[PDB]
Symmetry: C2
Subunit: 92 residues, 2 copies
């Protein structure tokens, strides 16, 4: 039940772990996200294995249209994912 804040900084260090390869700045493009998603969120988000699904999501975070998901853009990812968790019918 009680996990205190390990779930917040937990998801944060998780993103830092699966999304580690970037340019000069923390670009963290769809490559890293796709990796994290297919292996971590494999059971949460509908067909998170699908690049079409991942594209949809990535593009939903990357409103910048620059192919970069920051921890903040990943924050919206967790929005999609938590939705996929409770609304696990298919947040889509």
């Amino acid at each position: 039940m009680t996990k205190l804040e390990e779930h917040l900084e937990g998801i944060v260090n998780i993103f830092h772990q699966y999304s580690v390869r970037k340019g000069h700045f923390d670009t963290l493009s769809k490559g890293e996200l796709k990796q994290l998603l297919t292996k971590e969120l494999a059971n949460t988000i509908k067909n998170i294995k699908d690049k079409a699904v991942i594209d949809e999501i990535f593009q939903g975070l990357d409103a910048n249209q620059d192919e970069q998901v920051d921890f903040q853009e990943f924050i919206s990812l967790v929005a999609i994912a938590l939705k996929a968790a409770h609304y696990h019918t298919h947040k889509e």
Copy 2:
């Protein structure tokens, strides 16, 4: 490192646990959120103990201005909180 999806459904069942008292529908007002926040996110969000801080956040999720945070509105809460986690300087 690897927590798979326990962090997504984890936060979800966490909200379900600390925010359990509602009306006929899952209203889940600032009372339940304040509780979860002060005890869970006590170390993450800046002065999450402050009702002024919590108000700011709650109101940020409750765009409906109806005093109801759903799991989806709590989804934006986790957006604030994950931000408070990595950007732990003070998402504010």
